[PDB]
Symmetry: C4
């Protein structure tokens, strides 16, 4: 097909990459003991 | 097809929009320093 | 088909129902002022 | 098919297993009263 796979597949793919990106940053915490 | 895509697709779509809406609001916090 | 839809569909369906159930309970908090 | 199902299916499957694993551990807390 012209597209990589499907509109639903592409959207979920991007929504997943960012989801783990922003969610990971929020979970991560910087501390200096 | 008559429907936009599928029952499972439509449900997940709505469940995702709200999921990020309510979840985002809960994560967001208002503070006045 | 014999099954309601598909193995992947059924699994995700159950995993979603519980996901929102346990996740909702954890988010909910009881307080007595 | 040669593969268990599909590349997208396999990836999501693994990403889900770990997602619940690491996420569960983070949620879990050990305390000694």
């Amino acid at each position: 097909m012209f597209e990589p796979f499907q509109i639903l597949s592409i959207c979920s793919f991007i929504l997943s990459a960012l989801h783990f990106m922003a969610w990971t940053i929020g979970h991560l915490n910087q501390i200096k003991r």
